[PDB]
């Protein structure tokens, strides 16, 4: 003799020892990224090609 | 209906055609009386719950 069993309810596991099907469908995906940058240029110049006489002292 | 048939000992294959006409799904409501003892009897109300036309001569399972 087994216990009371419902009629219209689905067959769910209810006690220790009942079986149940697992459908393994796992799909995980993670990601990350980053960056950084910096820059600097400089260029100076000056040239007195032909100096007049009254400025030759400087 | 498939759950009941399976419980009784008949397993209908899944994904098959099944169109009935003499069956209706109902909600049953009742009033638990004071000091009720096991074995006694009460009165129930039966109400249809989807697209049924009539419950004229039906039997509640």
Curated annotation (Swiss-Prot), chain A:
Membrane spanning stretches: none
Q: Which domain of life is it from?
A: Bacteria
Query: Which subcellular locations apply to this protein?
Result: Cell outer membrane; Bacterial flagellum basal body
Q: What is known about its subunit structure?
A: The basal body constitutes a major portion of the flagellar organelle and consists of four rings (L,P,S, and M) mounted on a central rod.
Known function: Assembles around the rod to form the L-ring and probably protects the motor/basal body from shearing forces during rotation.
Q: Which family does it belong to?
A: Belongs to the FlgH family.
User: What is the designated name of this protein?
Assistant: Flagellar L-ring protein
Which source organism?
A: Salmonella typhimurium (strain LT2 / SGSC1412 / ATCC 700720)
Lineage of origin: Bacteria, Pseudomonadati, Pseudomonadota, Gammaproteobacteria, Enterobacterales
Q: Which gene encodes it?
A: flgH
Section of the entire sequence shown: 59 to 116 of 232
Curated annotation (Swiss-Prot), chain B:
The cellular location(s) given in this protein's UniProt record come to: Periplasm; Bacterial flagellum basal body
- Identify its protein family: Belongs to the FlgI family.
The record's subunit annotation is: The basal body constitutes a major portion of the flagellar organelle and consists of four rings (L,P,S, and M) mounted on a central rod.
Primary role: Assembles around the rod to form the L-ring and probably protects the motor/basal body from shearing forces during rotation.
Put simply, this protein is called Flagellar P-ring protein
What gene is this protein translated from?
flgI
* Full-sequence portion shown in this chain: 62 to 122 of 365
